[PDB]
Design a binder for this molecule. Sequence first.
Ligand SMILES: CCCCCCCCCCCCCCCC(=O)OC[C@H](COP(=O)(O)OCCN)OC(=O)CCCCCCCCCCCCCCC
Length: 179
Amino acid sequence: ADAQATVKTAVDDVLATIKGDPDLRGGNLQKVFQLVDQKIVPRADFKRTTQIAMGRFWSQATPEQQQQIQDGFKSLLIRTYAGALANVRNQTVAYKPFRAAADDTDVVVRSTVNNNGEPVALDYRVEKSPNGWKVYDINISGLWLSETYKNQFADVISKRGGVGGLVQFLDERNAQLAK
Ligand SMILES: CCCCCCCCCCCCCCCC(=O)OC[C@H](COP(=O)(O)OCCN)OC(=O)CCCCCCCCCCCCCCC
């Protein structure tokens, strides 16, 4: 499967799984985490997303901090979008032309979700790894998440004096979202 096929298959899997599970649609958060782990993670490279978000500070973090930040960032995103996922009912997705070369290894896949009549643009950055195509970024409301969080994280690291500050910030954000 090429980049666009990988994205299409994964997104269809997510949509079909939600539509078949009333408990997830009812807002069961544990099940949303499980959905992400089973249906998204195997087709994603979230370590790369986290690396991009940390920028020059990635190398400054201990291996343990790197894991904690990836886990906290992942939790932050799942909790942020859990409502949107649970609210899925009839959404379908159309793909725009794939414009990169077949031999390119870092590409963009562009799509439009029909959200109850409202076009919702979702684009994806996809990289071909030794173990297949993996999504490492998503574009929502015109913005690449890795870029938004790169800027947000750099600001936190600046104001709080380092990587430890970012861990603290992610803990705060996850606590706020849990409420
Ligand atoms: C970094 C790698 C990411 C890989 C992700 C690939 C999988 C894509 C799956 C896409 C499913 C789209 C369903 C939404 C459809 C919709 O229609 O949502 C409709 C809503 C609008 O809702 P509303 O009309 O109620 O208005 C709300 C006001 N009442 O739009 C949105 O909130 C914006 C789009 C949200 C898209 C969410 C995608 C999931 C984010 C990733 C979470 C996992 C991160 C952890 C990574 C390991």
